[PDB]
Design a protein around this nucleic acid. Structure first.
Ligand code: FES
Lengths: 146, 184, 401, 379, 49, 234, 55, 171
RNA sequence: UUUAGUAGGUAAAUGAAAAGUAUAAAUGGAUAUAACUUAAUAUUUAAUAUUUGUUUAAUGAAAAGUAUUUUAUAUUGUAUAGUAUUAUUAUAGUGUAUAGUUUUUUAAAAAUAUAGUUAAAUAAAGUAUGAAUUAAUAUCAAAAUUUUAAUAAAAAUUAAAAAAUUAAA
RNA sequence: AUUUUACCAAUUAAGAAGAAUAUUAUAAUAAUGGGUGUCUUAUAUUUUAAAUAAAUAUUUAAAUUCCGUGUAGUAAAUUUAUUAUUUGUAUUAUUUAUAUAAUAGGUGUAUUAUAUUUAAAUUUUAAAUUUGUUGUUUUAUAUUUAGAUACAUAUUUAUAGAUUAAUAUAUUUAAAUAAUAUUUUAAAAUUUAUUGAACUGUAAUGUUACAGUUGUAUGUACCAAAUAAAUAUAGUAAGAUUAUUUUAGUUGA
C-alpha cells in the first residue's frame, strides 16, 4: 500500500476522522542544502562509483575492433570482437558474450517489445588475444614514430 | 563449490549451484501448483493488535460469508479484510480456481512499518505518538466438498410485504437450455 | 522529565529543557517509512517534516530511463517486430502441446478429486490470446480440461485450427488486410467452435460473465449467417444466466432477425426466440413473453424448448389470478432472483460503514468525502453553508445561506 | 570451553553426519594399518622428512648428539675454525663438522662449527625470553591510541542538578559509562612498554636458537649467496636448484648472507638482496647475533612530548636474527662469511666467560696471539 | 559473578508466558527453582519418602 | 524427520546439526526434563522424537491445516526430473550434443554434474515413483524416458551413471532406519524401468478423428525412438 | 499504572463476555429479494421499491 | 507446562460442583473399593472419626500412594449414639466465620448435634482429612464424599453388604 | 539427622582455548559468561485520557514570517506573525460602520462544572485515531487466627477465595 | 430432530553493494587569517611591548625549610625534527552499522495453592544498605549492547659492608640495578574569561542609558544567573566494580 498505485486505496481505507495536516506546505524550510540518509548515500556511491577521481585506466589498451577472451564471470573462455567501449565506466561490449533482454515499455503508437543486446562487461574481465599467436597475450602501450 | 547430499548411505558431492537452483525451483513450483492463491498486503493502515481481532473473526469462513460479514461490519480491520478478499478473489479467478468453492485457509497479520507523530503537551512536555501499520496475509483455497448455508430465505414480514406488493416469493426461475454449436 | 531514549523514535515522554527537539510533525520509524509517510511522499513530494531530502532515483530509473528510447530505435523497432503468422503458429503449437500433456483427473470414489492446477497453460494461453485478439477464461479452460468429453471437443478443434493455419490460412488477418465480404472459412469456424467450447466450460463452472465475453469474441470472429445465429443464441443464454437482460434480449432479437438467412434444419432461431422470451420474463413483461413465445411457436411448431417455455408461462399465468393482474409497471424489475445477481450484489454492493453514499463519493474520476458530494446538498454538505456570493440573494429564506 | 564445565559435553548429537563421505572416509582394518598423521607423541606440527626435509648428513637420532659430522672425514677438504674453540659452560662438548654446499646444490668441502655458537644446548626459558621480547617489540605502538574523558569534546558543565530532574546525578558526562565517553586511563603509545633487552641474554638466546636449528638439522652452510642478475627470476631459479621451498606454505628459508669464506662482508650482496624480494616466506637477516646495548634516555617522563613507548629507545632492528623468525622459517642458511663474522664477534665474549684458571692458560695454548703486538700475522 | 545463564536458558522452554518469553525472568525463575529443589532434596525429600 | 527433509524431499538436512542458523541455540523447544539443560540426550530415539516433533513445520513439511501438495503424483515427479535435466544442461548444449567427441572442458564437467544431480534426484524420488507406478499415465512415462534422455543418463535396461553403485564400505554406510536410503539403486532403477515399460504397453493396449490419429502416430514414433535410444524394445 | 501485566492477565478480558460481544460477534444476514445484496433485517435501501416495501 | 484454567467451576455456576464418586479421573479408582460398616454406638467421636478416616482416605492399604485417591467406603451408623468423654459435649467449641465483619460463629457440639449429628461427624472427618492432606482441594474433598454418614441404624446401602468394621483402641 | 555405597584427588574464592600466538584454508559451536547509571529497540499502562468540524453579523500598517507569484497584477522591493503547533488568543498604527468577509461528532444513567418552608439544561458507549506517569514478580496475593527483628499479603495454623464490565480512594 | 465443551503453545537461516577514494593513531618536506552562487569603491580593511609557552626540560646528592614540590654542556648549526591526499586503497596497525519477520489451531487442567506428565511432596525475588546484622533503606519492565588497568616469572662476560653529632674509626659473613603504575561515578564547589536590560527593575521621552566585589525582589520558564574552559584536601557522603564446580590455623582480642 506504500506505492503510488495503491495510494488511493490506502486513502480510501483510512478513516475520514483522522486528519493529515501538512498536505501542501511544511513547517521546516525544504530549500536548505542538507545531507541524505546513510543508506541513500551508499546506494548512490554503488550506483555511480565511476565519479571518483582517476577512476579510468591510464594506458587504456582496450579499443573497439580488438579480439579478447573473457577470463572471469558468466562466460569464461568465450572470445569475440569488441563491439563498443565505455571509457568513463571502464566497460566493454563484446559480440555474443553478455547478451541480456532489453525490455521497452509500450507507448501510444507501439506495444511493449523485448530486444536483446550485448551489455557492458568490466574491462578487467577480458584479456587481449594476439592474432598471430591466437592466444592470451599481455599488452603494453608503446610509442613509435610513424 | 560442492554440496554434500546423503545418497545410498554415504555423502555425495553435487554441484552446489545446481542444487540450490533446483531446490528453489521445486519450492516455487510446488507452491504454485498448490490449489490456493496467497496474497500479501503490506503497510495496512491499521494497528496489528486491532487488525488481529477482525482477522480472528473472519478466520475459518467461506469466501461468500467472509465478504458478507466484512461488508456488514463497521470496522477498519473488516474493511481492510474486504479489500484483501477482493484482491485474492481476483487473483484466484486469474489463476483458474473455482469462485463458488473458495474458502479462507489462512488469515494472519504481523507488525509492519511504524510512523511517529509529535503530540505537544502542557508544562513543556512532549512525546511521540505511534502510527502503526500491519502486514496482512490472506490465503484462499478451494474446498469442493464445502456446502454453504441457504441464505436466500427471508423473514415472513418481507414475504408478506412482497405478496402485498404483488411480487412472487419464489424466484421466477426459467429453464435455460445449454449453449450448443450444432448450427456451426 | 526524561523517561525513554533521547532519539525522536523513543516512546516515552521527554521535556524541552533536557531533550530539546525540533517540531517534527511526522517522520518514519525504525522499521522504514509507513503508509502515512508514503502518502505524504506521493502527494506533497516529500515527508511532512521537510527536513528529509527527497530521493527518487530508483523511481526515475524504473520509469523514465526504461521508457526512454531514441528516435531511430523507436522508428526501427516497429519494422523489426516479429512475424505475426509464425508467432501465432508457434503459440498454437505450444498451447496444443501443453493442453495435450495436461494430466487427466482421477475419478475418485467417495469424494471429488481436486483438479490439478494449470500452471503451464497460462503462458501459452496468454500468447494465444495476444495473437488472436481474444481473451480465454482460465476457469473455462480448467473446466473444459477437467471434463472428458469437453476436453476432446476442445483438443480436436484446436488441432483443426492448427492444421488450417499451417496450411497458409489466416482468415482474420486476410480480412483485415483486405478491408485496409466472403463467408466463414474452415480456420475461422474451428476458432469459433473452440471459443464456444470454452464458453460451455465457463457456463459449467459458473462464470457466466466469462462465458458471455468468450462468446462475444467468437461472434466478432464469425461472419457466416448460421454461425452468427448460433453465437447470438449462445450469448443470449449466457447473458440470461449472467443477469444481463438487455444484452440477452438484443442477442435474441438479432438471432430471430437472422432467422431467414439460416436453413430450416438449424435451431438457432428457436434458441434466440427462447432467449428473448426469457429475457422478457425476467424483465417481468409476461404479455410480451407470451407474444414472443406464440410467434416462436408459429415459426417452429413442436420445438421442445418453445413447448417447455410455453408450459412454464402457462403455469405462471395460472398463478397470476392470485394477483388479479401482472406485476405493476411501477417496479416492473425490482425483484432479483439469479445467483449471478446475488454474487454481483455481494461484490459491488454498498457495504454498511464503507463503500456507500456516506463513506466516499466518486466524482468524475476522483474520490470525495460525503460532505463534498456534488450530487446532493444535504445537511452534511459544504454546499449548504454557501450562499449569496455577492451577485444576488438567490433564496427567500432568511436564516442561513 | 573448560573440560570440567557441563558446556563441554552439553552437545550430544548432530556433530557428525552418520553417513560417511564416499571420497576419502575409510575404516580401521587393524594395528597393521598405518594411519596418516598417527603418532604416539603430541606433535602439533606432525611433519616428516618428506614434508620438511632436513639438510644434514644424518637424521637427528637420539643415538647421535647432533646430525652433522663428528669427525673430519677425509673425502672432503676439511676447514678448521677461524678462531680457536674453547668449550664454555653450556656447550655440547662435541665436535661439530658440517658440509658446505655451493650454488649447484653439491657439497664442495666441510667446515668446523664453533660449539659456543652452534653447540650451546638450547634452553626453553632463554628461548622464550627472546621470543617474548621479539613479540612485544614487533607491535605497532602508534596504533594503540584511545580517547580520554578530557578528549571527548563535551561541555565542561554539569548537565543538570543532582536532584531536580529525576535521573542519576551526572555532570560533564564524558565518562566511560557513556558510549560517546572515554576512559580515565586509556591506552596510549607513550604509556605502552618496549622491553629492554640485555646483550648477554640476547646473544645467549640467539646462539641457543642456532643450536636448536642445528640439532633439528635445519642448518645449511653455503659457500656463496650471489645471483647472476639482481632480478627475482634468478633468485627463484637458485631456490629451485638448491631445493629451497620459499612458498608461503613450504617451510621457509632464513638467510644470513654475510659473505664468502675468503671475503666476508657485513653488507648484503647487492644482486641477491635485490632478487630476494619475493612474496613467499623467505627472510634475510644480518650475520650478527649480538645487539647494541639498549638505552633509554627518557627513562623518566622528562620529555612530555615523547610519542614512543616507555623503555628502550633502541629496539632490535627487524632484520636481526631472532627466535621468532628462526622458528617460523623451516630451513636456515648461513654463509662462510656469516660464520666468520659470528666467530669474530663472539670470540672475546667466550674468552671473557672462560674461568681464570683457563684464562691464564689461553695465551700458553696460543688463543691470545694479538696481531697488534706482532705475535701473529693479522687475522 | 557466575550464574547458570547458558545452562538454564536451555530449559527456559519449560516455563509459561513471561518467564518463557523474556530471558531474565526465565533465568531468575529457573535459578530459584533449582535452588529450592536442591534444598528440598537435601532436607525434606528423604523424610517424606 | 517430521520438521526436516522427509520421503521425497530433495534438500538434505541433518536435524540434529544446527546448520542454516545465524544464532547459537539458547532455548530448546522440545525439553522433557530439567536435566536436559546439560544432558539433552539428543540422538536417543524418544528425546529426539520430542525435539523433532516440537520443531515447527518448515517449507518441506506442511501444517495440519495448510493444503499439502501431491508430491507422490507421477505426473508431477516426471516433470520435476525433466526440469532438473533442463537446468543441468542448457538448451544450446543439448542441441549441440544432439547434432554431434569434441567438447570444452567446462561443458564436459557441466554434463557430468548434470548426470550426478539427475542420479541423486532419481534416488530421492524413487520411493514416490514406485508408489505412483499404479496410477501413472502414458504421457508421463514417455516423459520419464525423455527426461532420462535429456539428462543423458542411460537407464540400466540390462554415458552410463546408474549402472555403477556408489562407493563406500558396507560397514560404514548409513543404515539407520527412517531415512529413505536405496542401497540397491541400479537394481531398483532397472525394476522401475521394466515396470514403466510394461505400464506403457498396457496403456497402449487399453487405448487400442484426425487429431487422435496424429496423436497416436506421434506417440508411436516417440515411444519407438526413445526406447531405441535407451536400449529397449516394445 | 502500578505494575506490568502478563499474557494471562491480558487474556482475562477475552475470557470475559463483553470482549466477545464487542469484537467476536457474527452478523446474521440474507440476500435482499430486490437488490440481491447482503442485508440485515430491519435495515433497507433508499431505492423506491425498498422504501415502499421493506424486505 | 501445566496450566489450570482461571475459569473454574464455582458453586454459583449452573454447571455446579461435582461428586467425586461419579467422576472419572486418572487419580480416581473405584475398582478396588470395598464397603465397611462402622457402628458408632458408645464410641468416642474423635476415635470414630480417626478410624473412619483411615479407611476412607485409603491409608489402610499397603498399595497406598499419596497421589492416587483410592479408599474404601465406610457407612457410619448410630451416629446419634456417639459418645463424648465428659462435659465435652457442651465444653468443646466449633468455630467458623464469614467474610462479614461480625462474621464469627462460635457454637457447641450440643448445637451441632441438635441440628444434625451427621454434620458433627462430618466436621471431625474433615478435620482428620485436612490434617493429613490439606494442600489439594481434590484430596481434601474426595475422601469425604467416599464417607457415608447415618444417624440411625437404617441405611440404603444394604445392596453392598458393608462388612462390619472391627478395630481396637490404643488401650 | 551417632552410616555406608557410589561418585570421587586433597581439609573450599588468583578463568579456560595449539585456530592471527595461522600455514591452518569447504563442513574448527573458540558457547570465552556485568540482572541497577550507556545507546537503540519491543512491551505494560492501552478496550485508556485526548481528538471528533451542520453554519458565519466586525483592522486597509510596521518589526514578524520567505513557505518556488511560470508573465501574480532611473534603481529597488508587494500576500502565507508570536507563544516549541493550523494553540488561550484580532498583533490593531491609521481608520471605518448592513459584504449572509462561512469547517465543531454522537439515542440514557454515576461523578464533576456551570445552572405559595426557613435565615429543569450541557459533557455517552460504540465506529476511527491514539498518548502519559507507572511497571522485580512466578496464572497469584478472599478471609480469620497466631507469631517473627519497625506497615509486615514474611511465617504458621485455620479457612474457603469463580470470570468479565463499570463505579467507588 | 439436533449438534464438534472451557482452558492451555512456541522466534526463528537475512530478499538486494540499504556500508568504504570509511573510524582512530601513524608522514617531522606546505602554510598571510580556506569559503564556491565569486565578480569596483579603502578618510571607511593597523596589534605592536625582554616575563611558562601552540617554542613543552635524560638520576636518587647537598640545600634553604615547621611534610627538602628538587639533577648539571654532551657535543659547540649534530641527525628529537610540529610532520600530512599520494610517486603504493600513502604506509602500518585498529575499529565498524539492529531498514526488512505468515512460523504451528492444541502434551498435562476442568470445583484454586506454584516445571520436570504415577497424580504427591517442595516452592512463593535479587543486589546493595542495615555490624541492634531487620519488618530499615535504595535500585531493577524486558531485549541487545556500552561500561572500570597495582607487570603472580630475572641463566655464563659482573664487580654490592659499615659507622661517629663531628673529627674520626673501618676486628668483621649476602644479593636476580630494577624506577614510569595505583579502581570507577558523583561534592554544596571555587577559579579564569565572556555575554545578556527583546523578559524583568529604574532614569530619560516603542526606544535610549546602567550588568555579575553586581546593575535596578529581579536581571530571558532551576538567581549561590547565563555561556566557555577545569577531572579541588572525592577525603573524615554514597553507589558500582566483569573469571562457578573451590582444598587447611584461631570468630569479640
Ligand atoms: S435491495 Fe437489498 S436492501 Fe434494498
Amino acid at each position: 500500500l506504500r506505492d503510488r498505485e495503491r495510494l488511493e486505496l490506502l486513502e480510501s481505507m483510512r478513516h475520514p476522522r483522522e486528519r493529515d495536516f501538512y498536505q501542501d506546505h511544511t513547517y521546516h524550510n525544504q530549500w536548505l542544502r542538507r545531507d541524505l540518509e546513510k543508506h541513500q548515500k551508499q546506494q548512490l556511491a554503488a550506483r555511480y562509483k565511476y565519479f571518483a577521481p582517476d577512476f579510468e585506466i591510464s594506458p587504456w589498451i582496450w579499443y573497439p575492433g580488438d579480439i579478447v577472451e573473457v577470463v572471469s564471470g558468466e562466460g569464461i573462455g568465450q572470445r569475440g570482437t569488441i563491439i563498443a567501449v565505455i571509457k568513463y565506466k571502464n566497460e566493454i561490449v563484446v559480440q555474443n558474450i553478455n547478451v541480456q533482454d532489453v525490455v521497452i515499455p509500450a507507448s501510444e503508437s507501439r506495444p511493449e517489445q523485448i530486444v536483446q543486446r550485448e551489455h557492458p562487461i568490466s574491462v578487467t574481465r577480458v584479456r587481449h588475444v594476439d592474432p598471430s599467436t591466437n592466444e592470451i597475450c599481455n599488452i603494453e602501450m608503446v610509442k613509435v614514430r610513424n | 563449490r560442492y554440496a554434500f547430499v546423503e545418497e545410498e548411505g554415504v555423502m555425495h558431492k553435487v554441484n552446489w549451484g545446481l542444487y540450490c537452483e533446483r531446490l528453489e525451483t521445486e519450492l516455487t513450483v510446488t507452491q504454485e501448483r498448490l490449489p490456493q492463491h496467497t496474497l500479501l498486503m503490506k503497510a495496512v493502515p491499521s494497528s496489528w493488535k486491532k487488525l488481529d481481532i477482525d482477522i480472528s473473526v473472519i478466520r475459518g469462513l467461506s469466501l461468500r460469508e467472509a465478504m458478507a460479514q466484512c461488508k456488514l461490519s463497521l470496522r477498519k480491520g473488516h474493511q481492510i479484510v474486504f479489500r484483501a478478499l477482493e484482491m485474492a478473489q481476483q487473483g484466484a479467478e486469474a489463476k483458474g480456481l473455482d469462485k463458488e468453492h473458495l474458502r479462507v485457509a489462512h488469515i494472519s497479520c504481523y507488525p509492519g512499518p511504524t510512523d511517529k507523530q509529535i503530540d505537544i503537551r502542557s508544562k513543556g512536555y512532549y512525546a511521540w505518538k505511534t502510527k502503526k501499520s500491519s502486514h496482512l496475509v490472506l490465503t484462499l483455497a478451494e474446498d469442493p466438498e464445502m456446502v454453504l448455508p441457504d441464505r436466500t430465505c427471508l423473514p415472513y414480514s418481507s414475504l408478506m410485504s412482497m405478496k402485498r406488493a404483488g411480487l412472487s416469493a419464489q424466484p421466477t426461475v426459467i429453464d435455460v437450455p445449454a449453449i450448443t454449436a450444432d448450427g456451426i | 522529565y526524561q523517561r525513554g531514549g533521547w532519539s525522536p523514535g523513543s516512546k516515552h515522554q521527554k521535556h524541552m529543557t533536557l531533550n530539546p527537539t525540533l517540531y517534527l510533525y511526522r517522520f518514519p520509524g525504525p522499521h522504514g517509512p509507513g503508509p502515512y509517510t508514503m502518502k505524504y511522499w506521493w502527494t506533497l513530494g516529500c515527508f511532512p517534516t521537510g527536513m528529509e531530502v527527497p530521493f527518487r532515483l530508483h523511481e526515475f530509473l524504473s520509469t523514465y530511463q526504461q521508457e526512454h528510447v531514441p528516435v531511430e530505435v523507436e522508428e526501427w523497432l516497429r519494422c523489426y517486430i516479429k512475424d505475426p503468422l509464425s508467432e501465432l503458429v508457434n503459440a498454437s503449437n505450444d498451447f496444443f502441446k501443453a493442453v495435450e500433456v495436461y494430466p487427466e483427473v482421477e475419478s475418485a470414489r467417495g469424494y471429488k478429486t481436486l483438479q490439478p492446477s494449470i500452471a503451464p497453460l497460462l503462458v501459452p494461453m496468454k500468447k494465444f490470446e495476444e495473437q488472436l485478439g481474444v481473451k480465454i477464461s482460465p476457469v473455462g479452460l480448467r473446466s473444459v480440461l477437467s471434463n472428458p468429453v469437453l476436453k476432446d471437443r476442445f483438443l480436436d478443434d484446436l488441432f483443426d485450427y492448427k492444421s488450417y493455419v499451417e496450411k497458409g490460412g489466416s482468415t482474420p488477418h486476410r480480412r483485415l488486410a483486405r478491408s485496409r465480404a466472403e463467408t466463414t472459412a474452415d480456420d475461422e469456424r474451428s476458432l469459433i467452435l473452440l471459443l464456444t467450447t470454452i464458453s460451455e466450460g465457463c457456463i459449467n463452472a459458473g462464470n457466466y460473465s466469462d462465458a458471455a465475453s468468450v462468446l462475444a469474441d467468437a461472434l466478432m470472429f464469425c461472419h457466416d449467417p448460421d454461425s452468427q445465429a448460433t453465437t447470438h443464441a449462445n450469448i443470449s443464454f449466457a447473458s440470461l444466466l449472467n443477469a444481463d437482460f438487455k444484452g440477452a434480449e438484443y442477442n435474441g432479437r438479432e438471432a430471430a432477425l437472422l432467422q431467414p438467412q439460416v436453413k430450416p434444419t438449424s435451431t438457432a432461431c428457436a434458441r434466440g426466440y427462447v432467449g428473448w422470451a426469457a429475457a422478457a420474463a425476467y424483465q417481468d413483461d409476461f404479455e410480451k413473453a407470451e407474444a414472443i413465445v406464440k410467434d416462436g411457436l408459429t415459426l417452429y411448431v413442436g420445438n421442445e424448448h418453445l413447448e417447455k417455455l410455453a408450459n412454464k408461462l402457462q403455469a405462471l399465468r395460472e398463478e397470476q389470478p392470485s394477483v388479479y393482474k401482472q406485476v405493476p409497471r411501477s417496479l416492473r424489475e425490482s425483484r432479483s432472483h439469479l445467483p449471478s445477481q446475488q454474487s454481483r450484489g455481494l461484490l459491488s454492493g454498498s457495504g454498511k460503514g464503507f463503500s456507500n453514499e456516506f463513506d466516499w463519493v466518486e466524482f468524475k474520476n476522483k474520490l470525495y468525502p460525503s460532505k463534498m458530494d456534488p450530487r446532493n446538498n444535504e445537511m452534511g454538505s459544504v454546499f449548504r453553508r454557501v450562499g449569496d456570493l455577492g451577485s444576488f440573494i438567490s433564496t427567500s429564506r432568511s436564516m442561513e445561506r | 570451553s573448560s573440560i570440567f564445565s557441563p558446556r563441554y559435553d552439553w552437545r550430544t548429537s548432530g556433530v557428525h553426519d552418520i553417513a560417511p563421505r564416499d571420497e576419502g572416509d575409510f575404516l580401521y582394518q587393524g594395528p597393521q594399518h598405518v594411519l596418516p598423521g598417527a603418532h604416539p607423541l603430541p606433535l602439533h606440527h606432525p611433519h616428516n622428512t618428506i614434508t620438511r626435509p632436513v639438510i644434514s648428513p644424518y637424521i637427528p637420532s637420539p643415538q647421535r648428539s647432533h646430525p652433522y659430522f663428528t669427525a673430519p672425514l677425509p673425502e672432503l677438504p676439511h676447514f678448521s675454525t677461524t678462531k680457536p674453540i674453547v668449550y664454555t659452560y653450556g656447550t655440547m662438548k662435541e665436535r661439530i663438522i658440517a658440509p658446505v654446499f655451493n650454488l649447484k646444490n653439491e657439497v664442495i668441502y666441510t667446515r668446523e662449527l664453533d660449539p659456543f655458537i652452534f653447540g650451546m644446548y638450547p634452553e626453553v626459558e632463554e628461548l622464550s625470553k627472546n621470543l617474548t621480547y621479539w613479540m612485544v617489540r614487533c607491535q605497532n605502538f602508534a596504533s594503540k591510541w584511545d580517547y580520554e574523558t578530557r578528549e571527548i569534546w563535551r561541555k565542561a558543565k554539569k548537565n543538570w542538578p543532582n536532584t531536580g530532574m529525576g535521573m542519576p546525578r551526572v555532570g560533564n558526562r564524558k565518562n566511560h559509562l557513556y558510549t560517546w565517553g572515554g576512559r580515565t586511563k586509556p591506552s596510549k603509545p607513550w604509556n605502552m612498554l618496549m622491553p629492554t633487552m640485555d646483550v648477554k641474554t640476547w646473544s645467549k638466546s640467539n646462539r641457543m636458537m642456532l643450536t636448536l636449528k642445528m640439532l633439528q638439522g635445519r642448518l645449511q652452510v653455503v659457500d656463496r649467496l650471489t645471483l647472476e642478475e639482481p632480478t627475482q627470476e634468478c633468485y627463484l631459479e637458485l631456490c629451485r636448484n638448491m631445493s629451497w621451498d620459499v612458498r608461503h606454505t613450504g617451510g621457509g628459508v632464513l638467510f644470513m648472507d654475510g659473505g664468502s669464506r675468503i671475503t666476508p662482508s657485513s653488507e648484503f650482496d647487492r644482486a641477491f638482496f635485490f632478487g630476494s624480494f619475493f612474496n613467499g616466506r623467505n627472510k634475510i637477516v644480518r650475520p650478527t647475533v649480538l645487539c647494541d646495548e639498549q638505552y633509554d634516555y627518557n627513562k623518566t617522563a622528562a620529555k612530555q612530548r615523547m610519542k614512543g613507548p616507555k623503555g628502550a629507545k633502541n629496539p632490535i632492528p627487524i632484520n636481526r636474527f631472532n627466535a621468532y623468525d628462526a622458528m617460523k622459517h623451516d630451513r636456515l642458511v648461513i654463509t662462510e662469511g656469516a660464520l666468520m663474522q659470528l666467530e669474530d664477534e663472539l670470540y672475546e665474549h667466550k674468552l671473557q666467560i672462560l674461568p681464570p684458571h683457563i684464562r691464564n692458560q689461553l695465551p700458553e695454548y696460543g688463543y691470545l696471539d694479538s696481531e697488534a703486538l706482532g705475535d701473529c700475522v693479522p687475522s | 559473578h557466575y550464574r547458570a545463564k547458558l545452562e538454564l536458558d536451555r530449559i527456559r522452554s519449560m516455563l509459561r508466558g513471561r518467564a518463557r518469553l523474556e530471558r531474565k525472568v526465565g533465568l531468575k525463575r529457573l535459578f530459584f527453582l533449582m535452588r529450592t529443589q536442591t534444598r528440598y532434596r537435601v532436607e525434606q525429600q528423604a523424610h517424606w519418602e | 524427520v517430521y520438521g526436516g527433509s522427509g520421503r521425497g524431499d530433495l534438500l538434505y538436512e541433518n536435524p540434529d546439526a544446527r546448520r542454516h542458523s545465524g544464532r547459537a541455540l539458547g532455548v530448546l523447544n522440545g525439553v522433557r526434563h530439567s536435566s536436559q539443560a546439560t544432558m539433552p540426550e539428543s540422538g536417543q530415539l524418544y528425546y529426539r522424537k520430542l525435539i523433532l516433533h516440537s520443531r515447527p513445520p518448515n517449507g518441506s513439511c506442511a501444517g495440519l491445516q495448510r493444503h499439502c501438495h501431491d508430491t507422490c503424483n507421477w505426473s508431477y515427479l516426471i516433470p520435476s526430473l525433466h526440469r532438473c535435466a533442463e537446468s543441468a544442461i542448457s538448451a544450446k548444449l543439448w542441441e549441440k550434443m544432439c547434432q554431434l567427441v569434441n567438447l570444452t572442458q567446462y561443458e564436459r564437467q557441466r554434463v557430468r554434474d548434470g548426470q550426478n544431480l539427475y542420479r541423486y534426484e532419481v534416488h530421492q524420488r524413487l520411493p514416490l515413483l514406485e508408489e505412483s507406478i499404479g496410477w501413472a499415465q502414458l504421457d508421463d512415462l514417455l516423459g520419464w524416458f525423455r527426461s532420462a534422455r535429456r539428462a543423458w543418463v542411460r537407464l540400466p535396461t540390462s554415458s552410463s551413471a546408474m549402472s555403477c553403485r556408489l562407493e563406500g564400505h558396507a560397514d560404514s554406510r548409513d543404515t539407520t532406519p527412517g531415512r529413505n536410503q536405496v542401497f540397491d539403486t541400479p537394481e531398483r532403477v532397472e525394476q522401475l524401468t521394466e515396470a514403466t515399460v510394461h505400464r506403457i504397453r498396457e496403456e497402449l493396449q487399453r487405448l487400442n478423428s484426425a487429431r487422435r490419429l496424429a496423436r497416436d502416430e506421434e506417440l508411436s514414433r516417440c515411444v519407438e525412438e526413445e526406447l531405441g535410444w535407451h536400449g529397449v524394445a516394445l | 499504572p502500578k505494575r506490568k501485566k502478563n499474557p494471562m492477565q491480558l487474556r482475562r478480558k477475552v475470557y470475559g463476555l463483553h470482549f466477545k460481544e464487542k469484537y467476536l460477534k457474527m452478523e446474521e444476514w440474507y440476500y435482499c429479494p430486490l437488490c440481491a445484496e447482503p442485508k440485515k433485517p430491519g435495515e433497507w435501501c433508499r431505492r423506491e421499491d425498498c422504501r415502499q416495501i421493506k424486505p | 507446562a501445566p496450566f489450570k484454567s482461571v475459569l473454574r467451576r464455582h458453586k454459583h455456576h449452573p454447571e455446579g460442583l461435582p461428586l467425586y464418586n461419579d467422576m472419572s479421573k486418572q487419580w480416581l479408582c473405584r475398582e478396588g473399593e470395598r464397603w465397611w460398616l462402622l457402628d458408632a454406638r458408645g464410641e468416642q467421636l474423635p476415635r470414630v472419626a480417626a478410624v473412619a478416616a483411615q479407611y476412607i482416605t485409603g491409608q489402610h492399604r499397603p498399595d497406598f500412594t499419596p497421589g492416587m485417591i483410592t479408599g474404601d467406603h465406610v457407612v457410619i451408623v448410630n451416629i446419634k449414639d456417639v459418645v463424648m468423654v465428659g462435659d465435652q459435649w457442651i465444653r468443646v467449641p466449633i468455630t467458623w466465620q464469614t467474610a462479614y465483619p461480625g462474621g464469627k460463629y462460635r457454637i457447641r457440639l450440643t448445637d451441632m448435634y441438635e441440628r444434625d449429628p451427621c454434620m458433627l461427624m462430618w466436621w471431625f472427618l474433615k478435620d482428620e482429612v485436612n490434617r493429613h492432606f490439606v494442600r489439594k482441594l481434590k484430596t481434601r474433598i474426595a475422601p469425604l464424599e467416599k464417607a457415608w454418614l447415618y444417624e440411625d441404624s437404617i441405611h440404603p446401602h444394604a445392596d453392598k453388604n458393608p462388612r462390619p468394621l472391627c478395630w481396637t483402641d490404643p488401650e
